[PDB]
Design a protein around this ligand. Structure first.
Ligand SMILES: [Mg+2]
Ligand SMILES: [Zn+2]
Lengths: 108, 939, 235, 97
């Protein structure tokens, strides 16, 4: 699993160098497609980890109130919220050559 | 309620196939048969059983409720009621279920005997008129002569046309046993009439043999007209034959025994206020068809006389023809208001058809719109977003974060919290906005820069904050303009926006590759003011002139200490390119403001030591992007924007009546022009010159006076305050204003054109120009004169914007299919490009024209034999300089016109992508970019 | 005020009200010369107003403006006199009919009728069979290829004759295009932008090319671990 | 500003106008801009799951709320209407993979 605590991906939108992004494939569109597929995978993994963590801190309350207050759950959710977005993590992985891609049609 | 997972998986497809519809196919797709022409009961507003809106065929009107109300709620899903026959399901099914109409007699589709060319006529070889006589039930035609012979003994041939009397006579002359023969018996005499005859005749066609005979006839016939007709029939038969390998395409399917009925929701019966109903024409046409078919069936059952039966069959054919395409009929069925009814065919063509109305444009969710204000403190990739707009747009993301935080367990409670605008909502929205850009669009979107991606920031108020540098791309000012906000949702869309549509990435103009995020107005004026030099005078000594500095650090120290002026001429030691192109330290005479400007300039660009205007700024940004990457250029743009704004604010540059210096000699030269005009007039009165000559001389004198006055006014304003006059600084920098406008504010508005309606010649020029200017004030007469030109200009713009848009639309339509699909097609053909010269003046240099192209062959220097250009390589700026240094006048480069690609254009023939100053990459929609680039300036 | 009408006239291949017409240049100097003339004229009109647009855009447009040829002799091909066809279709038809034989007189042959285009191998086999049967031999003539001359269209006419039937129906003459497609059984492969916009699929440009749907991605560390495990299991 | 709201009768598109709480119109020229950028996914998402993909829009909203992967776009309702008209006019149209 990725070390989300020590990730170098930018938190917000940043001006990325297009030449570095498409250097490996020679086509910015192919790189964008690969990055988005990896971003979908990263988002799935992050959702699974967050769901497990929330289930660990989930408290069973039988009250019929519409608003609940769980400070530990709120803190965990805030920590996950402050992390970079999945697509930013995918871009950071792509820049660091941490994404493996293969074209099935070209290798057939 | 969570939407039910409709297990009808979205049919994945990459191919669309069309063909003739078999009756069996229509029966297979149909859910039932429509007997009654009634639509609904006028009292209970419920659909009539077996009608055009019946619930047994098309589906229940109410969700999970049958027609009779026996079964209700979702618990009876999939159950068809035994009492009313209506399936218990969703109302949405009333959009997909199709009905059918079982016709008593077959009928031909208008599309295949009225369209040019007619398919049935070319298949059967019959002319259109004869086919019409067949279809509308006029004459019988012999399908099979058999043993029947003419009254005089003449041989009867196939396709022969017989009148009713002739048909009866031939039947009487034949033995009764002939009628009892099977249709496959060659001796049987078969002669029918109408669409039944048409299907019987089409089913007997050997398409292969028909193509054989048509080809042989075309090859052997000596008549040109007959050869052309044979080839034209051959065309239809070969097309229909080529249809067969793809799919079952049988010619007799052109005559339908069954007519399908489209789902009712596509032809709605909408009740209006007051008990009135709004109905589509399609309901009326279908109702007419059922009425006529039922009348034919009844007349068949009662065995009506043959003339009446043929008339009713012809009227059924007319009803079917009208329902398919009414408009082609001369006697089209019309309403009481004489408006022709809209048929099924009319739903497709025209500006209001499906294709151009509901498929090419749409309204979208997750969208917003407000007024735009200037956020000059923002970065190039950031936009300010009002709190309400962000809360509504990002509502489901905020809901997700609320459920994740455990505050609310349901989406309803999350919506309640969001609507109350609690601080936790803002705390979550601040994180949600990060990394999720929005798309800003201003109509009209003339080029692709009309939609750009920005990183949103929460702000106060109800106006969207826009970065000033995006205004030129958006053509947006802050006089009341509005922009639409579009929110991408998926990760692919977000990455697409960030990596292609981000404002920081869109520095270049795709039309030419020049920078489009150039500073303007306040920024340019401030940069010009800071970078301009001031020399010392005894009245106004300049602090710090002549000092030498070890680097920009000491210059900054002195400026902050107020020991040197901003415009002082100083000497500093810093990096600059030498004659060899290397980075060395040298003492260069400069200005403190120029040093401060160079403190933010990227190092690799050298030292910039010129007074900054818009043109020089554009060239500087282009060079900086040439030597560095896009992010560095964006940071440079942000820094110079802030610097220009700050140094324009600090100077307090204003507009006063004292800056508009009307020359004191204005009256004297107006008087001299008046004496010259008087000389011309007295010359005319003595007959020395003609009327046209006097008019031309007077115009020449007045225009010479205007030119001299413009030059004198410009000189006065320029030399005022050593070039630091605010109006002169505004004009010279290119921030705002032109020479003509300053002339009108200071000199004389000059000659004006008459509004006369002369059909032959253009507008004549009034011999008396507008002597007064806007500082002196125009008289009543002069103002009335100028109103003509003002109104003319406004009308011209308002009327020609649409023509420019239409040209853009046509270009996009003609160029949409050009996409870079292959890297190299390997052509040896190219275009020979030379420097563009007009009237002995080089308008475009050879290097500028060949910049970004791919070389055809290798090019060698004729003087030094050095390899300047390699075949198959892009022409970069360094190669441009090398070519300009060498005595080369013509360069052969690969061009789209000479490309040999199978689909679209290859990458090498296109050359450089002007939006990135890099080689074009596979997938670029170069055709749309070309169309937009041509169309935008016209608007 | 006159620049926009001039541009519209140039792009439409319209003869001037006082006729050099592009058709004359195409007839005399050739296709490349007329393409260069059109590009230069349009770019000059745009330049007079102080607007800089690269020549490559006009070149791309003019390429689409010259995608058709006019046939001067049908030969034995499927096409018709004075018909406007795609250059690719003309070349494909000429290549398909090349080297074949058209039956002039069928003689006593039962498998061949007069008027069919047959390959030389088939004709030789049929004549050999007839010779074994001692019957009259089939006489066939060489296939005659069609000839055509390049023509220059306006933007409207060029757009009006697209290959896909969905796009053509969307543009104009919906009835005729739909009729011809339904009779011909035409299959639309969705190769343009207008078609995919209409149907709501990914456009075949930029990110949405068909090659990119076949790409399989994954974590490089995970792939290396999987490969190492596979190698360990192979031992 | 609108995330979701009422939809029209025939086209099933989101309504227009501020009084009806509707979305903005995204027409031909702006689609040309998207095509020029090569923004395939943005154009697909806008043409289907934001305008007239009835199942797609609901599934997309549910996925955004629950944080799941975005469902694949379906057939727009405008294309369904076009296909139904062409079928009612007697032309056999099939979707082939
Ligand atoms: Mg405005
Ligand atoms: Zn090429």
């Amino acid at each position: 699993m990725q070390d989300l605590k020590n990730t170098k991906a930018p938190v917000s939108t940043a001006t990325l160098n297009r030449n570095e992004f498409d250097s490996k494939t020679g086509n910015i569109y192919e790189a964008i497609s690969i990055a988005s597929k990896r971003a979908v995978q990263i988002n799935s993994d992050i959702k699974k980890e967050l769901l497990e963590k929330l289930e660990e801190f989930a408290t069973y309350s039988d009250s019929l109130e519409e608003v609940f207050e769980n400070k530990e759950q709120i803190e965990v959710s805030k920590f996950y919220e402050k992390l970079p977005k999945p697509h930013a993590l995918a871009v950071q992985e792509w820049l660091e050559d941490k994404i493996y891609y293969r074209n099935t049609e070209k290798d057939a | 309620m969570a939407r039910i997972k409709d297990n009808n998986a979205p049919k994945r497809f990459n191919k669309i196939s069309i063909g003739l519809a078999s009756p069996e196919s229509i029966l297979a797709e149909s859910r039932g048969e429509v007997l009654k022409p009634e639509t609904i009961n006028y009292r209970t507003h419920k659909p009539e059983r077996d009608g055009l809106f019946c619930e047994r065929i098309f589906g229940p009107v109410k969700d999970y409720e049958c027609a009779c109300g026996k079964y209700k709620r979702i618990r009876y899903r999939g159950i068809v009621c035994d009492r009313c026959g209506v399936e218990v399901t969703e109302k949405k099914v009333r959009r997909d279920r199709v009905g059918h109409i079982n016709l008593v007699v077959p009928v031909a589709h208008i599309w295949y005997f009225r369209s040019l060319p007619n398919k049935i006529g070319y298949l059967l070889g019959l002319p259109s008129k004869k086919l019409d006589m067949i279809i509308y039930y006029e004459r019988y035609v012999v399908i099979q002569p058999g043993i029947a012979k003419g009254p005089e003994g003449e041989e009867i041939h196939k396709l022969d046309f017989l009148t009713e009397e002739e048909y009866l006579n031939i039947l009487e002359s034949l033995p009764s046993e002939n009628q009892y023969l099977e249709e496959n018996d060659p001796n049987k005499f078969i002669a029918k009439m109408g669409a039944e005859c048409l299907i019987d005749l089409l089913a007997r066609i050997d398409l292969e043999q028909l193509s054989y005979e048509l080809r042989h006839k075309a090859n052997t016939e000596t008549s040109k007209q007959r050869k052309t007709e044979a080839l034209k029939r051959l065309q239809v038969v070969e097309a229909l034959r080529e249809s067969q390998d793809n799919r079952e395409n049988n010619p007799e399917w052109m005559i339908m025994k069954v007519i399908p009925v489209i789902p009712p929701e596509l032809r709605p019966l909408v009740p209006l206020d007051g008990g009135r109903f709004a109905t589509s024409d399609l309901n009326d046409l279908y109702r007419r068809v059922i009425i006529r078919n039922n009348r034919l069936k009844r007349l068949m059952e009662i065995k009506a006389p043959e003339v009446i039966l043929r008339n009713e069959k012809r009227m059924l054919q007319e009803a079917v023809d009208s329902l398919f395409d009414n408009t082609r009929k001369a006697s089209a069925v019309k309403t009481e208001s004489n408006r022709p009814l809209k048929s099924l065919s009319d739903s497709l063509k025209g500006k209001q058809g499906r294709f151009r109305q509901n498929l090419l444009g749409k309204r979208v969710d997750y969208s917003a719109r407000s007024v735009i204000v200037v956020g000059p403190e923002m970065k190039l990739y950031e936009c300010g977003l009002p709190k309400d707009m962000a809360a509504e747009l990002y509502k489901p993301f905020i809901i997700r974060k609320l459920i994740e935080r455990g505050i609310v367990k349901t989406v309803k409670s999350a919506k309640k919290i969001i609507d109350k605008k609690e601080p936790v909502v803002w705390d979550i929205l601040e994180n949600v906005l990060k990394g999720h850009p929005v798309l800003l669009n201003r109509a009209p979107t003339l080029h692709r820069l009309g939609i750009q991606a920005f990183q949103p920031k929460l702000i106060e108020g109800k106006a969207i904050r826009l970065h000033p540098l995006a205004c030129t791309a958006f053509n947006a000012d802050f006089d009341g303009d509005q922009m639409a906000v579009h929110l991408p949702l998926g990760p692919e869309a977000i990455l697409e926006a960030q990596l292609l549509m981000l404002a920081s990435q869109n520095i270049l103009n795709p039309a030419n590759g020049s920078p489009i995020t150039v500073p303007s107005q306040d920024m340019v004026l401030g940069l010009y003011y800071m970078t301009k030099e001031k020399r010392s005078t005894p009245e106004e000594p300049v602090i710090g002139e002549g000092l030498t500095f070890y680097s920009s650090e000491e210059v900054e120290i002195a400026f902050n200490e107020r020991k040197v002026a901003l415009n002082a001429i100083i000497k500093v030691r810093t990096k600059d390119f030498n004659e060899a192109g290397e980075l060395v330290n040298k003492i260069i005479e400069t200005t403190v403001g120029r040093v401060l400007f160079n403190t933010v300039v990227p190092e690799q660009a050298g030292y910039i030591n010129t007074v900054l205007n818009k043109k020089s700024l554009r060239n500087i940004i282009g060079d900086i992007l040439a030597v560095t990457d896009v992010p560095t250029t964006a940071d440079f743009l942000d820094k110079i924007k802030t610097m220009g704004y700050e140094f324009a604010f600090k100077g307090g540059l204003s507009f006063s009546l004292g800056d508009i210096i009307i020359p004191k000699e204005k009256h004297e030269m107006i008087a001299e022009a008046n004496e010259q005009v008087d000389g011309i007039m007295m010359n005319y009165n003595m007959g020395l010159i003609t009327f046209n000559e006097r008019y031309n001389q007077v115009i020449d004198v007045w225009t010479s006076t205007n030119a001299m006055l413009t030059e004198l006014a410009m000189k006065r304003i320029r030399e005022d305050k050593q070039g630091f006059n605010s109006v002169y600084m505004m004009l010279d920098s290119g921030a705002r204003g032109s020479k003509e406008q300053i002339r009108q504010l200071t000199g004389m508005r000059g000659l004006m054109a008459k509004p006369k309606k002369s059909t032959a010649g253009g507008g004549e020029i009034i011999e008396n120009p507008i002597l007064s200017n806007f500082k002196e004030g125009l008289s009543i007469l002069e103002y009335f004169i100028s109103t003509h030109g003002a109104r003319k200009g406004l009308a011209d713009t308002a009327l020609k914007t649409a023509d420019a848009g239409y040209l853009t639309r046509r270009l996009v339509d003609v160029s949409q299919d050009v996409i870079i699909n292959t890297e190299d097609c390997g052509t040896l053909r190219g275009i020979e490009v030379e420097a563009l010269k007009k009237n002995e003046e080089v308008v475009e240099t050879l290097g500028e024209r060949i910049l970004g192209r791919v070389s055809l062959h290798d090019v060698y220097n004729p003087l030094t034999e050095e390899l300047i250009l390699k075949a198959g390589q892009e022409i970069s700026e360094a190669d441009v300089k090398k070519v300009e240094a060498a005595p080369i006048e013509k360069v052969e480069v690969r061009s789209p016109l000479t490309c040999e690609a199978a689909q679209g254009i290859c990458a090498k023939c296109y050359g450089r992508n002007l939006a990135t100053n890099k080689m074009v990459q596979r997938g670029e929609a170069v055709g749309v970019v070309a169309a937009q680039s041509i169309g935008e300036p016209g608007t | 005020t006159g620049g926009l009408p001039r541009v519209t006239e140039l792009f439409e291949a319209r003869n001037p009200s006082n006729p050099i017409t592009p058709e004359d240049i195409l007839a005399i100097k050739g296709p490349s010369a007329v393409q260069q003339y059109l590009v230069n004229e349009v770019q000059e009109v745009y330049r007079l107003q102080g607007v800089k647009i690269n020549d490559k855009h006009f070149e791309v447009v003019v390429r689409q403006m010259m995608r058709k040829v006019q046939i001067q002799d049908s030969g034995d091909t499927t096409f018709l006199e004075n018909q406007l066809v795609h250059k690719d279709d003309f070349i494909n038809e000429n290549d398909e009919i090349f080297g074949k034989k058209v039956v002039e007189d069928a003689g006593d042959s039962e498998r061949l009728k007069p008027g069919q285009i047959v390959t030389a191998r088939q004709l030789r086999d049929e004549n050999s069979i007839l010779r074994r049967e001692d019957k009259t031999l089939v006489t066939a003539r060489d296939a005659v290829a069609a000839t055509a001359t390049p023509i220059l269209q306006g933007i409207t006419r060029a757009s009006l004759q697209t290959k896909s039937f969905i796009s053509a129906a969307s543009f104009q003459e919906t009835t005729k295009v739909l009729n011809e497609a339904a009779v011909n059984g035409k299959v639309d492969t969705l190769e343009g932008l207008k078609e995919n916009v209409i149907v709501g699929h990914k456009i075949p440009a930029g990110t949405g090319m068909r090659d990119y749907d076949s790409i399989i991605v994954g974590s490089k560390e995970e792939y290396d671990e999987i490969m190492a495990r596979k190698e360990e299991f192979k031992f | 500003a609108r995330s979701i709201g009422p939809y029209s009768l025939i086209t099933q598109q989101p309504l227009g106008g501020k009084a009806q709480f509707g979305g903005q119109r995204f027409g031909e020229m702006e689609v040309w801009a998207l095509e020029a950028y090569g923004a395939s996914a943005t154009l697909r998402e806008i043409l289907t799951v934001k305008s007239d993909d009835v199942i797609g829009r609901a599934k997309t909203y549910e996925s955004i709320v629950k944080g799941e992967t975005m469902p694949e776009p379906g057939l727009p309702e405008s294309f369904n209407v076009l296909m139904h008209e062409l079928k009612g006019l007697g032309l056999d149209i099939r979707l082939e993979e």
